[PDB]
Structure formats: structure tokens, C-alpha cells
Design a protein around this ligand. Structure first.
Ligand SMILES: O=P(O)(O)OC[C@@H](O)CO
Length: 411
């Protein structure tokens, strides 16, 4: 058998599902063996695959999160464009089958998808319904209601009211799209490499300062980067938790309480109504430099991932959105949204309203490094070392230096 190495960043419950998907494909035919290899978080996985390339130890497939997309698109010569791979191997590829938000996020300016959609997400408001009921609180729709609900929870003995993971994705990037304000110039990077950051504005700063003020009395508690704060939610310590829809699998198996999810809170001091939310998660990039049989097996595996049945199963088990309209309709016909209430929140929120350039998503080179900058500066806010205005200004300044580095190399 010819081996197809797939380097990915899926840990926990969702990583076990990756292993089940790979092995199910392996069991259906006898020519190709997909070998999934966990390489760490998204940054570590991307970094490892790129570093392995010139050592010729790189995988056939690498999962690269949305953050890394501009960098991967500029890495011409390192990637095998998926549409070319599939045609070369005799496998179908129909980009129009994917959700419009996915296509618009990942297509080149010429309308091509270079990578294979797989695990797309958006952040949702997770909540502990059991704790809300005990506190006489209601599921919030606005930021005022978030604070009031947090107060009721902590008054009723909850360790803390609200927290969030992936804080830049949640409270800067999605917060901006949700309120139709720009994250950077040149349509959040889609219209040019001469972009600069725009999130250092009063609307974002005022909300971050309001959250920081909630640390007193434990209405808010910071719980670290990425998904580090997941056990604060699943242990029953915090009653509200904003993070990826893709924590559904983990929450469903680890939470001893009744849980739900709803759309992100609206900051009514910024907008009268929400816009839409934006993509997280990853796509699958096929790397150059391998042989024909390895690419044939790669393409056949991507076909296996292209089926509505596998796409619906992945969405149902993880909380990543159904990546095609067909997978969504299959899940609906299966009664999944009736039997598992709230699991259509993420797909609805991505497409809540006709998008604007501010709600399409983001496309910034060197955004892996910018993400560290923004997380560091937000941590300064929660620690009380900086105001949100100063921290966002520093994040934008430091981020712009990285955008300029990318622009200088990308010509
Ligand atoms: O949806 P997940 O896979 O948790 O990833 C969130 C990450 O893409 C935010 O940048």
C-alpha cells in the first residue's frame, strides 16, 4: 500500500474522529493507507509541515487554520492546487458545492479554491442552562444581558459568569464582523497586501474595557488562549463561554449539566442589529514534491471526505459546520437539528445577512505572528497593565510591522 501522511491539529475528541475517518477510508479499499499524524496546535502543525518541506519529510496533506491562509496562498511552489490535483487524478471537484461563506473566504481573487474545505467553524455563545435556571437568569442576546446574567450566576455561587477562548478570533475578529466594522484596510486584506489594521478603535476598545472591568466580582475570568478555558465551562465553573462551534463534541461528552448554544451577543452601544459572523477552523492543503501514487491516494482520500455523508457525520460529531449545502440538508432530513437543538446556530450565524467587506472574513499575511501580538496585548488588558485603547493601539502598530514584512516578501 501507498501511504498518505496527513498532518493535523485536531486534538481531544475531534482528533479521535479524524482517526476514525482516516481508518474508515483505509478499510474501503486496499491501495492507499491514510496516516493521520497529530502535530500540535494549529500554529505548531503549520510550522512543522513548512519546516519539513525542504528536508523532504513533509506530508501529503497538512491542515492549516484560517489564520494561515494568506501565507499558504503566497507559497506558490510549495503547494499542489487541489483543483489541479483532483483533475490530474480523475476525481471530481465542485467548489460551488461548499457553503457560500466558505467559498468566498478561501477562493483566490480568480475564483479558485487551492485547498480542500473540511473543518469550518464560527464562535457561538455556549451556556450552562442548568446554572442559568438555578440563578433565575435568561439566555442573553446582548452584551448588557451578558453582564446581567453573569451577575446573577455569581450571586448564585457560580465561580464566574463568562469567559471565552480564541480571544482574538472571538472578541476582535468576530466582534468586528458581527458589528460590521473593519478589521483592516483593503477589505480586511482581501483587496491588497498594502493593508493595515483597523481594529484599534473605540467600539472594540470600549467592549474590552467593559469585559476587563467585569473581573472584579468574578463576572469575567480570563482562562488562557485557544481552548485552554474549555474545562472552566465543562466543569461548571463559568456559566457562559464564547468559543468555536467545534467544541460541541467535547462539551457533549464532558459537561454534566444541560447545555446550549446561541448566537454571539450584540453590543447595542455599537449596532442596533448584528451583521454575520466569520470563519474559523482550517482547510486541507496538498504539498508539492511527492510522487504520482501518493497524489492518487491523496485525491481518493479527498473524494472520500467530499461525500455529503462523511461531511454530515463530521459536522454532527464535532460542531464544525456542514461544509456543503448537501451535508446540511442531509443532517436536517436526518432530524439532527430537531434531536440536537442549537447545532444549526453556527451555519445560520455565518450567513445571517448579506455580507459586506467587513463581514467576509480576513486575509492577512503573517497573521500567525499577529495572533500572538493580539493575544499578548489582550492579556495585558485582563491583567490591568494596559487600557484596551493602549493595548489595541500597540497590537495594531506591532501587527502592521508584520504586515509590511509580508508585503515586502510577497513581491
Ligand atoms: O474552530 P476551531 O478549529 O476550534 O479553530 C478556531 C481557530 O480557527 C480560530 O482562529
Amino acid at each position: 500500500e501507498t501511504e498518505v501522511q496527513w498532518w493535523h491539529a485536531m486534538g481531544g475528541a475531534n482528533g479521535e474522529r479524524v482517526n476514525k475517518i482516516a481508518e474508515d477510508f483505509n478499510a474501503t479499499q486496499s491501495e492507499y493507507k491514510v496516516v493521520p499524524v497529530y502535530k500540535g496546535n494549529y500554529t505548531e502543525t503549520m510550522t512543522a509541515a513548512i519546516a519539513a518541506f525542504r528536508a523532504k519529510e513533509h506530508p501529503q496533506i497538512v491542515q492549516v487554520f484560517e489564520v494561515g491562509t494568506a501565507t499558504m496562498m503566497a507559497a506558490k511552489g510549495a503547494i499542489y492546487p487541489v483543483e489541479k490535483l483532483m483533475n490530474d487524478a480523475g476525481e471530481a471537484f465542485d467548489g460551488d458545492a461548499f457553503l457560500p461563506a466558505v467559498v468566498s473566504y478561501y477562493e483566490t481573487p480568480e475564483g479558485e479554491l487551492l485547498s480542500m474545505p473540511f473543518n469550518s467553524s464560527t464562535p457561538v455563545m455556549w451556556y450552562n442552562k442548568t446554572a442559568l435556571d438555578a440563578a433565575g437568569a435568561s439566555v442573553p442576546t446582548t452584551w448588557d444581558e451578558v453582564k446581567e446574567t453573569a451577575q446573577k450566576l455569581v450571586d448564585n455561587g457560580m465561580d464566574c459568569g463568562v469567559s471565552f477562548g480564541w480571544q482574538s478570533w472571538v472578541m476582535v475578529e468576530n466582534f468586528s464582523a458581527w458589528h460590521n466594522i473593519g478589521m483592516g484596510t483593503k477589505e480586511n486584506g482581501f483587496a491588497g497586501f498594502d493593508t493595515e489594521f483597523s481594529f484599534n478603535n473605540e467600539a472594540v476598545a470600549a467592549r474590552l474595557d467593559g469585559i476587563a472591568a467585569m473581573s472584579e466580582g468574578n463576572l469575567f475570568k480570563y482562562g488562557g488562549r485557544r481552548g485552554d478555558s474549555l474545562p472552566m465551562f465543562t466543569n461548571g465553573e463559568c456559566g457562559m463561554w464564547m468559543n468555536s462551534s467545534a467544541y460541541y463534541g467535547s462539551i457533549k461528552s464532558q459537561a454534566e449539566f444541560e447545555f446550549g448554544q446561541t448566537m454571539l451577543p450584540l453590543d447595542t452601544s455599537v449596532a442596533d442589529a448584528p451583521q454575520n459572523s466569520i470563519i474559523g477552523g482550517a482547510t486541507l492543503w496538498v504539498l508539492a514534491g511527492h510522487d504520482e501514487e501518493e497524489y492518487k491516494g491523496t485525491a481518493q482520500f479527498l473524494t472520500y471526505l467530499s461525500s455529503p455523508e462523511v461531511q454530515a457525520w463530521w459536522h454532527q460529531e464535532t460542531g464544525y459546520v456542514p461544509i456543503t449545502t448537501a451535508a446540511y440538508e442531509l443532517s436536517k432530513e436526518q432530524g439532527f437539528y430537531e434531536s440536537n437543538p442549537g447545532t444549526d446556530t453556527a451555519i445560520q450565524q455565518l450567513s445571517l445577512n448579506t455580507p459586506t467587506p467587513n463581514s467576509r472574513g480576513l486575509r492577512f499575511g503573517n497573521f500567525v505572528q499577529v495572533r500572538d501580538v493580539i493575544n499578548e496585548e489582550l492579556e495585558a488588558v485582563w491583567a490591568g497593565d494596559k487600557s484596551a485603547t493602549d493595548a489595541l493601539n500597540a497590537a495594531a502598530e506591532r501587527g502592521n510591522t508584520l504586515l509590511r514584512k509580508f508585503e515586502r516578501s510577497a513581491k
